[PDB]
Amino acid sequence: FLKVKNWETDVVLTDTLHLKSTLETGCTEHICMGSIMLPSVATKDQLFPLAKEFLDQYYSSIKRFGSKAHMDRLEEVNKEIESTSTYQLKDTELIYGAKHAWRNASRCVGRIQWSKLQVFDARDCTTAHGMFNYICNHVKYATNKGNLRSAITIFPQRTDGKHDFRVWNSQLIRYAGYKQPDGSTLGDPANVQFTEICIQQGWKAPRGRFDVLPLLLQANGNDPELFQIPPELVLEVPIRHPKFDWFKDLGLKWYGLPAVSNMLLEIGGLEFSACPFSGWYMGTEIGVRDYCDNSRYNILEEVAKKMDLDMRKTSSLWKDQALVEINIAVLYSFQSDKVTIVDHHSATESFIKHMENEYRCRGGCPADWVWIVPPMSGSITPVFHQEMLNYRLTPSFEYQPDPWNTHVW
Ligand code: HEM
Ligand SMILES: N=C(Nc1ccc(CCNCc2cccc(NC(=N)c3ccoc3)c2)cc1)c1ccoc1
Ligand SMILES: C[C@H](O)[C@H](O)[C@H]1CNc2nc(N)[nH]c(=O)c2N1
Numbered sequence: 001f002l003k004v005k006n007w008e009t010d011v012v013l014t015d016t017l018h019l020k021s022t023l024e025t026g027c028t029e030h031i032c033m034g035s036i037m038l039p040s041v042a043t044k045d046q047l048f049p050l051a052k053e054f055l056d057q058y059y060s061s062i063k064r065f066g067s068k069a070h071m072d073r074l075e076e077v078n079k080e081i082e083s084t085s086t087y088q089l090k091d092t093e094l095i096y097g098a099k100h101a102w103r104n105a106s107r108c109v110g111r112i113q114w115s116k117l118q119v120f121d122a123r124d125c126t127t128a129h130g131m132f133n134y135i136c137n138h139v140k141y142a143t144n145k146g147n148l149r150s151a152i153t154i155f156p157q158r159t160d161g162k163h164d165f166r167v168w169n170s171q172l173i174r175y176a177g178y179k180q181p182d183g184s185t186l187g188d189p190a191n192v193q194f195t196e197i198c199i200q201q202g203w204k205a206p207r208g209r210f211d212v213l214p215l216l217l218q219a220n221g222n223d224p225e226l227f228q229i230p231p232e233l234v235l236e237v238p239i240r241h242p243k244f245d246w247f248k249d250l251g252l253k254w255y256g257l258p259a260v261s262n263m264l265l266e267i268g269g270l271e272f273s274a275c276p277f278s279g280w281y282m283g284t285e286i287g288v289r290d291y292c293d294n295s296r297y298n299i300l301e302e303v304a305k306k307m308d309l310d311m312r313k314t315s316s317l318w319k320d321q322a323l324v325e326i327n328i329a330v331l332y333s334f335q336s337d338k339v340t341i342v343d344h345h346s347a348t349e350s351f352i353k354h355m356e357n358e359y360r361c362r363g364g365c366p367a368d369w370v371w372i373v374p375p376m377s378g379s380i381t382p383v384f385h386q387e388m389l390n391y392r393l394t395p396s397f398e399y400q401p402d403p404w405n406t407h408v409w
């Protein structure tokens with residue numbers, strides 16, 4: 001029965017949800033691994049407790065725990081796991097599982113929206129083209145002409161493991177990254193390997209900074225296939241500043257729709273290796289990390305230059321000064337174009353309120369401070385002063401290796 005405190009408001013919450021936790025954290029009694037980035041085929045013995053646990057909280061959530069349809073469903077799944085050494089979720093159990101995987105995502109600050117999630121059952125898909133068709137429909141729906149809506153598209157579950165549905169892209173919409181003969185990098189340096197994996201598979205690269213990558217779609221373990229998202233479905237914001245007319249000359253833009261496609265969804269012991277999910281951006285992922293990480297677009301050099309800043313000393317804070325202007329520009333551009341976006345002040349305040357609800361109606365809220373606190377202006381947002389317990393609940397989104405490190409080609 002643990003206690004978390006907010007040191008800006010003295011609000012105290014009591015966490016009992018963590019008792020339901022199950023998986024490992026990495027930490028021990030004598031070492032904390034809270035800042036480690038990455039934290040690290042089935043059998044049927046393993047599968048039933050995972051189905052039981054899941055199906056018990058599912059009927060419990062609709063106020064029908066332990067009774068008739070519950071006992072039937074437990075027996076039903078028990079029998080199918082005997083017969084098949086796997087089983088299939090109902091439409092309603094898939095929707096509950098997906099929403100709760102997001103609800104348990106301790107690194108996600110946007111979880112006040114967890115129940116407002118559109119689930120697309122793509123479990124009847126069989127080919128890369130079908131995957132292409134489902135993904136285009138996801139993009140179109142979730143983008144909603146800028147009025148973004150959250151959605152997940154769920155492809156068939158892992159069975160043996162040699163037949164695995166995978167989206168090889170990191171995000172459905174990501175900009176390309178090309179190295180140059182002179183060592184430097186054009187575009188997004190994060191994606192340079194994947195960009196070349198597509199060029200390998202015959203992609204024809206326009207070789208600019210902001211080239212929307214093609215999709216590489218792997219279906220039932222077969223080789224992955226290239227598909228170009230129709231450009232009309234890829235909504236993009238050109239980045240301008242509401243003071244600096246020279247900011248347009250920077251020629252920056254970003255896509256409106258963040259849609260993660262390399263994660264693994266775990267529902268009731270079942271594994272969905274292809275499950276692209278989308279919401280909207282917090283401003284700082286673009287303005288701070290994408291634009292200003294040294295390993296990414298790294299534009300602080302070229303913005304402070306145009307801001308006429310003393311760049312010879314670190315202590316002039318020219319970096320910080322240009323970081324803020326870059327983020328005023330992302331927000332202003334997105335809002336002027338009516339493309340849903342949230343600022344780190346609005347999102348972290350909403351997450352405090354979300355935490356309030358989760359301790360009220362659930363007994364806790366797993367939360368990773370290292371990831372929840374925004375990468376700029378940490379302590380002027382309310383989550384900096386919020387103590388948070390981190391623990392792993394299920395259903396969950398897990399990391400998974402990149403398919404080209406593992407696919408017997
Ligand atoms: C609705 C608007 C949403 C906002 C504003 C939001 C915001 C964020 C941000 C800023 C991060 C940190 C990302 C990073 O620094 O790499 C994050 C992480 C995450 N989000 Fe949310 N998100 C939203 C929707 C969703 C949805 C719809 C899902 C799943 C259905 C989701 C699942 C996750 C997961 C699993 C992580 C952790 C990823 C990792 O550990 O690498 N989020 N979110
Ligand atoms: N793997 C490396 N780093 C690395 C880098 C990043 C990550 C995780 C990044 N998740 C992207 C992500 C995940 C979840 C949400 C968002 N955003 C959203 N708003 C959003 C997207 C969908 O709904 C809301 C964005 C994990 C590892 C690496 C290896 C070598 O060098 C670097
Ligand atoms: C080393 C550290 O764990 C790593 O840099 C983390 C820090 N916090 C983060 N927080 C978010 N939201 N996203 C990130 O990628 C990271 N990176």
Ligand SMILES: OC[C@@H](O)[C@H](O)[C@@H](O)CO
Binds near residue numbers: 190296
């Ligand atoms: O939206 C996520 C952003 O693309 C970055 O945070 C990357 O994780 C690497 O900088």
Ligand SMILES: [Zn+2]
Binds near residue numbers: 027031033034
């Ligand atoms: Zn720890």
